[PDB]
Enzyme design. Structure first.
Site, short mmCIF file in Angstrom:
data_model
loop_
_atom_site.label_atom_id
_atom_site.label_comp_id
_atom_site.label_asym_id
_atom_site.label_seq_id
_atom_site.Cartn_x
_atom_site.Cartn_y
_atom_site.Cartn_z
N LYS A 1 0.21 3.47 -2.94
CA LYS A 1 -0.93 4.37 -3.01
C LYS A 1 -0.42 5.79 -3.22
O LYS A 1 -1.13 6.58 -3.75
CB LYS A 1 -1.85 4.28 -1.77
CG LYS A 1 -2.72 3.03 -1.88
CD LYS A 1 -3.64 2.78 -0.70
CE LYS A 1 -4.52 1.54 -0.94
NZ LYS A 1 -3.76 0.34 -0.65
N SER B 1 0.79 -1.23 0.00
CA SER B 1 0.00 0.00 0.00
C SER B 1 0.83 1.28 0.00
O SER B 1 0.24 2.37 -0.12
CB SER B 1 -0.94 0.04 1.20
OG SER B 1 -1.92 -0.99 1.14
N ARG C 1 5.34 -0.68 13.34
CA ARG C 1 5.92 0.13 12.27
C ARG C 1 6.12 1.56 12.75
O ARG C 1 7.24 2.10 12.68
CB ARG C 1 5.03 0.08 11.03
CG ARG C 1 4.89 -1.33 10.46
CD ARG C 1 3.85 -1.37 9.41
NE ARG C 1 2.51 -1.01 9.89
CZ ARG C 1 1.43 -0.95 9.12
NH1 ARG C 1 1.50 -1.28 7.84
NH2 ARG C 1 0.26 -0.61 9.64
N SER D 1 -6.35 2.77 3.69
CA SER D 1 -5.61 1.95 2.76
C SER D 1 -6.55 1.06 1.94
O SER D 1 -6.39 -0.16 1.86
CB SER D 1 -4.55 1.11 3.49
OG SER D 1 -3.46 0.80 2.64
C1 LIG Z 1 -4.10 -1.16 5.98
C2 LIG Z 1 -2.87 -1.42 5.64
C3 LIG Z 1 -1.77 -0.80 6.49
O1 LIG Z 1 -2.07 -0.15 7.53
O2 LIG Z 1 -0.57 -0.95 6.13
C4 LIG Z 1 -2.38 -2.25 4.45
O3 LIG Z 1 -1.97 -1.43 3.32
B1 LIG Z 1 -1.64 -2.40 2.33
O4 LIG Z 1 -0.32 -2.67 2.17
C5 LIG Z 1 -2.81 -3.38 2.49
C6 LIG Z 1 -3.30 -4.31 1.56
C7 LIG Z 1 -4.34 -5.14 1.95
C8 LIG Z 1 -4.81 -5.05 3.24
C9 LIG Z 1 -4.29 -4.15 4.16
C10 LIG Z 1 -3.26 -3.29 3.76
#
Ligand SMILES: C=C(C(=O)O)[C@@H]1OB(O)c2ccccc21
Length: 241
Positions: free
Chosen positions: A49, A46, A226, A94
């Site tokens: 994004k 993500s 994180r 996300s």
């Molecule tokens: C919510 C997320 C986070 O806080 O990192 C996460 O973002 B993605 O990498 C992602 C993809 C699928 C499900 C969840 C996520």
């Protein structure tokens, strides 16, 4: 680049392994606990994004940060995804399926050209146009994330100033009278090794500290590490109180 192995204590404290990379913009100096892992390229998950938002905005796929992308009615495991979203809340929570639709509308030829223009990671979008950042060929290291974020900070990416300002707004994560954090989390689970990401920067009155961290993440239970480990490093280096 300087290596500071003392930050490994923060990972070890939580029975974790990973890397934090910092970049002091004023002094043009980088710091990390692991120069090898700092340059190891992973799926962005993500954290993608950020470029996806920029491209979507610049191609008019997203008109502005208020445009509503209606939930497609499919119930998914993450409850916050099962509702309408704008760019701000889709970044915050996300929301993968919103960004999958962006990517399909962008299309593979324009996606590839933009990532080359952004000098983004290994620039390889092999895989499904709507999941390659989760289970396709794109790979980016923590130090490459910083190179990319620095261009975004300075409005130097090959998209409009408006697109870059809107995404930096949508990256807003935390602020108080001491600092501002603009950042994006990621969690790569589809391909091993499962890792968590946090990338972005810390704005102070007179400097900016870019950061990019990733850590092994076998289960979703440690995702809060994180931010917690990054912040222990930021505090140790006197960047935040
Ligand atoms: C919510 C997320 C986070 O806080 O990192 C996460 O973002 B993605 O990498 C992602 C993809 C699928 C499900 C969840 C996520």
């Amino acid at each position: 680049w300087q290596e500071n192995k003392s930050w490994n204590a923060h990972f070890t404290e939580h029975k974790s392994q990973g890397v934090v990379v910092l970049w002091n913009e004023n002094k043009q100096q980088g710091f990390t606990n692991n120069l090898k892992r700092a340059n190891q390229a992973f799926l962005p998950a993500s954290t993608f994004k950020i470029p996806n938002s920029l491209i979507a905005l610049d191609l008019g796929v997203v008109k502005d940060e208020h445009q509503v992308f209606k939930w497609d009615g499919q119930t998914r495991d993450i409850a916050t995804w099962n509702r309408d979203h704008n760019l701000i809340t889709a970044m915050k929570y996300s929301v993968v399926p919103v960004y999958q639709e962006f990517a399909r509308q962008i299309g593979e030829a324009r996606m590839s050209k933009m990532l080359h223009a952004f000098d983004y990671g290994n620039e390889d979008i092999s895989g499904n146009v709507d999941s390659f950042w989760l289970d396709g060929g794109i790979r980016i290291s923590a130090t490459e994330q910083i190179s990319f974020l620095r261009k975004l900070y300075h409005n130097k990416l090959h998209v409009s100033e408006r697109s870059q300002r809107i995404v930096k707004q949508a990256m807003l994560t935390e602020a108080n009278g001491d600092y501002i954090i603009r950042a994006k989390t990621g969690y790569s689970t589809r391909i091993e090794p499962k890792i968590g990401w946090w990338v972005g920067w810390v704005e102070l009155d007179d400097n900016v500290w870019f950061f990019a961290m990733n850590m092994d993440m076998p289960t979703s239970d440690g995702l809060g590490l994180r931010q917690a480990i990054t912040k222990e490093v930021l505090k140790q280096e006197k960047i935040i109180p």
